[PDB]
Enzyme design. Structure first.
Site, PDB file in Angstrom:
ATOM      1  N   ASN A  30      -8.648  70.166  78.033  1.00  0.00           N
ATOM      2  CA  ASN A  30      -8.572  69.680  76.795  1.00  0.00           C
ATOM      3  C   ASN A  30      -8.936  70.709  75.698  1.00  0.00           C
ATOM      4  OD1 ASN A  30      -7.749  66.653  75.818  1.00  0.00           O
ATOM      5  ND2 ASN A  30      -8.782  66.443  77.495  1.00  0.00           N
ATOM      6  N   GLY A  31      -9.621  70.530  74.716  1.00  0.00           N
ATOM      7  CA  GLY A  31     -10.026  71.505  73.751  1.00  0.00           C
ATOM      8  C   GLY A  31      -9.246  71.071  72.418  1.00  0.00           C
ATOM      9  N   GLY A  34      -5.061  71.349  72.116  1.00  0.00           N
ATOM     10  CA  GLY A  34      -4.236  70.406  72.361  1.00  0.00           C
ATOM     11  C   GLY A  34      -4.297  70.123  73.958  1.00  0.00           C
ATOM     12  N   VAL A  36      -3.746  70.281  78.332  1.00  0.00           N
ATOM     13  CA  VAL A  36      -3.231  70.942  79.393  1.00  0.00           C
ATOM     14  C   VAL A  36      -3.008  69.921  80.471  1.00  0.00           C
ATOM     15  CG1 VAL A  36      -3.527  73.088  81.186  1.00  0.00           C
ATOM     16  CG2 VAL A  36      -4.312  73.194  78.840  1.00  0.00           C
ATOM     17  N   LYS A  51       0.874  73.361  79.010  1.00  0.00           N
ATOM     18  CA  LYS A  51       0.066  73.331  77.661  1.00  0.00           C
ATOM     19  C   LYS A  51       0.818  72.720  76.460  1.00  0.00           C
ATOM     20  CE  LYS A  51      -3.022  76.107  74.833  1.00  0.00           C
ATOM     21  NZ  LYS A  51      -3.816  77.514  74.571  1.00  0.00           N
ATOM     22  N   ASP A 141     -11.074  85.720  72.948  1.00  0.00           N
ATOM     23  CA  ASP A 141     -11.867  84.510  73.445  1.00  0.00           C
ATOM     24  C   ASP A 141     -12.113  84.454  75.055  1.00  0.00           C
ATOM     25  OD1 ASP A 141     -13.323  82.209  73.200  1.00  0.00           O
ATOM     26  OD2 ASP A 141     -11.353  80.593  73.413  1.00  0.00           O
TER      27      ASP A 141
HETATM   28  O1  LIG Z   1      -4.151  76.054  86.062  1.00  0.00           O
HETATM   29  C1  LIG Z   1      -4.038  76.352  84.772  1.00  0.00           C
HETATM   30  N1  LIG Z   1      -2.945  77.033  84.365  1.00  0.00           N
HETATM   31  C2  LIG Z   1      -3.398  77.113  82.700  1.00  0.00           C
HETATM   32  C3  LIG Z   1      -2.545  77.587  81.828  1.00  0.00           C
HETATM   33  C4  LIG Z   1      -2.892  77.599  80.466  1.00  0.00           C
HETATM   34  C5  LIG Z   1      -4.450  76.983  80.009  1.00  0.00           C
HETATM   35  C6  LIG Z   1      -5.246  76.586  81.125  1.00  0.00           C
HETATM   36  C7  LIG Z   1      -4.465  76.431  82.384  1.00  0.00           C
HETATM   37  C8  LIG Z   1      -5.123  76.045  83.708  1.00  0.00           C
HETATM   38  C9  LIG Z   1      -6.260  74.994  84.296  1.00  0.00           C
HETATM   39  N2  LIG Z   1      -6.545  75.019  85.812  1.00  0.00           N
HETATM   40  C10 LIG Z   1      -7.906  74.166  85.832  1.00  0.00           C
HETATM   41  C11 LIG Z   1      -8.445  74.142  87.109  1.00  0.00           C
HETATM   42  C12 LIG Z   1      -9.726  73.386  87.058  1.00  0.00           C
HETATM   43  C13 LIG Z   1     -10.074  72.950  85.711  1.00  0.00           C
HETATM   44  C14 LIG Z   1      -9.513  73.303  84.251  1.00  0.00           C
HETATM   45  C15 LIG Z   1      -8.215  73.979  84.576  1.00  0.00           C
HETATM   46  C16 LIG Z   1      -7.399  74.538  83.547  1.00  0.00           C
HETATM   47  N3  LIG Z   1      -7.563  74.600  82.242  1.00  0.00           N
HETATM   48  O2  LIG Z   1      -8.611  73.847  81.499  1.00  0.00           O
END
Ligand SMILES: O=C1Nc2ccccc2/C1=C1/Nc2ccccc2/C1=N\O
Ligand SMILES: O=C1Nc2ccccc2/C1=C1/Nc2ccccc2/C1=N\O
Lengths: 343, 339
Positions: A30-31, A34, A36, A51, A141
């Protein structure tokens, strides 16, 4: 199940949209930005992350513009983007874990992450930073939640470029970016003329955290954070304060003298790990190692050993395929970065 | 049982050293500032708090100088101070609870604090702010952990003046004070010319939190915090930013923020506290006079435990100095009845 088909534009190359179908949608993050989602591509069966952010049509999304230009093994790839409802949808690589979740697992198990993984993850983070910084782009960040990990291959990918920006000499930048515990002192002091070295300080905080089992500079206020920093680095000299923020307002800080860095970490902590931390977490921004110099640090020599293997028995991910662009800040480092055996 | 006897200077009277003996010491609070202990005075057997911090010889302790001049029912009292080892020890009143702990008890039980307590606690916090602000002193770290509460009398006392400072027009002040969730937008934006109204924004965040059951503007970065603020207040106008690259979301009907049946006056007070333009926020005294607090001015009001409410109307001229005419609302008719 529900199959969604959209016409999407490829992340790289010429702007030529194609029909793309996907299914098995579910939230994974989340966040404020927006949401994901994870989804599966009908064609390949591949898992991807989407996203989704509200986009004001009258302006170009800066994250999208930055992502379309990035192409690196340690950065999540932008596969496609499309609009829906108005929302911008970024279709990216899906990675199953984060440094945040893995560190937490070890943490509440009373165990520390084996150093071989600290070496692998940190080295890959520094490679991703050398790459974006060579284009003048600062992430702004860097934190555990933005470091994706694949448990089995030990591959790490930097993600979330929602705060990223190309920093240009003489142009002011907001000091309110970057998450709490990972902010460089100059940001806490309110500087608007900071450089990409703020990402290096953030990376040093992540390294220290993985070695310690908890954040190294916690605090609910900037004042509390600065006190934790002073207890370790000692009181900033008047000159150091000047270098962090030319326009400092002046505060009275208890004059404390440097706490032996070796006294910070547990006894078994590799000495090279401690030395790297001290070269990253420095008050003077220009005194901090650059990402490329960090990759070349002796703490990472084990990764350059011909026989190194992952604990699960597999080989390490690709660590030496440096490009000219990646090495541009200091070409001669290639003699250390690309070991004799590698190709 | 170990007994400690020290010679200490009185908090505010003439400098006549006194012998103070105490025992049963234990840590009740920690922080980057310095440790706060609870202790028991040998003689009266009464409990006190001792805040101990390292004391540089370059300057005299700012918290100490500020607390020697404060005297108010809603501010923890400095009884004595003495040095040891060098450490400065401040002996203060002890209060057994904090708004932070009480709010967490309700929150993890899926309930919210009854509104009568939100009224009592917030009114007393605003009184303490009207008082320190009348001296030009800004607390700069208003948050639930710094609001002490006595469970049985419903008395609230503001504590921890480690960040407090007299704000003087034209003099710059650091923007890195104040805890995460409670920071006014102008501090997030890095202003160094802010006023005491940053305490008012912080107080509004505490009120909203007690009504909601969780912080109203959370976020790990200043950017995340500003996004939560914008979702509620709407996008800052260029002028508002001036007085203090985000998505232009509009004004969120504060009513949509709280659970159904939340008092409308509570919501209106929150909107008058949490305003972008600092000068547009209510002053502490104006907040005390707000209709959300009318129930506290009713002659028959009682605490749920049946006891009477704490003293709420004994305002001094100093306390009222920012706007004397407000006394006609602040001191209710029954409080003016001749003895
Ligand atoms: O696999 C991913 N590709 C992304 C591209 C952009 C932003 C996030 C992600 C993302 C994420 N993979 C995860 C696996 C476990 C817990 C949280 C996330 C996550 N996001 O919390
Ligand atoms: O009773 C007190 N007088 C003080 C004076 C200055 C600073 C703190 C205190 C203080 C405190 N009382 C408490 C009761 C429960 C949990 C924490 C505290 C605390 N502080 O955490």
């Amino acid at each position: 199940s529900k199959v969604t088909t959209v016409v999407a534009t490829p992340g790289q190359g010429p702007d030529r949209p194609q029909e793309v179908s996907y299914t098995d949608t579910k939230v994974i993050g989340n966040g404020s930005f927006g949401v994901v989602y994870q989804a599966k591509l009908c064609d390949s069966g591949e898992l991807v992350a989407i996203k989704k952010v509200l986009q004001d049509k009258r302006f170009k999304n800066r994250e999208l513009q930055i992502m379309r230009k990035l192409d690196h093994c340690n950065i999540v790839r932008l596969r496609y983007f499309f609009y829906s409802s108005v929302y911008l949808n970024l279709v990216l690589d899906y990675v199953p874990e984060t440094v945040y979740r893995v560190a937490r697992h070890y943490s509440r198990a009373k165990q520390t992450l084996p150093v071989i993984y600290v070496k692998l993850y940190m080295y890959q983070l520094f490679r991703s930073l050398a790459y974006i910084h060579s284009f003048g782009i600062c992430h702004r960040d860097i934190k555990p939640q933005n470091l994706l990990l694949d448990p089995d291959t030990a591959v790490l990918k930097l993600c979330d470029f929602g705060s990223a920006k190309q920093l240009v000499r003489g142009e002011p930048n907001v000091s309110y970016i970057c998450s709490r515990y990972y902010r460089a002192p100059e940001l806490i002091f309110g500087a608007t003329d900071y450089t990409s070295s703020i990402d290096v300080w953030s990376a040093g905080c992540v390294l220290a955290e993985l070695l310690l089992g908890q954040p190294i500079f916690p605090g609910d206020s900037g004042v509390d954070q600065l006190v934790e920093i002073i207890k370790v680095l000692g009181t900033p000299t008047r000159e150091q304060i000047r270098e962090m923020n030319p326009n400092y307002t002046e505060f009275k800080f208890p004059q404390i003298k440097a706490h032996p860095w070796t006294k910070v970490f547990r006894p078994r902590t590799p000495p090279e790990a401690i030395a790297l931390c001290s070269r990253l977490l420095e008050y003077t921004p220009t005194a901090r190692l650059t990402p490329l110099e960090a990759c070349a640090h002796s703490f990472f020599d084990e990764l350059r050993d011909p026989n190194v293997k992952l604990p699960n028995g597999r080989d390490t991910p690709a660590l030496f395929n440096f490009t000219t662009q990646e090495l541009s800040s200091n070409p001669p480092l290639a003699t250390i970065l690309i070991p004799p055996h590698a190709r």
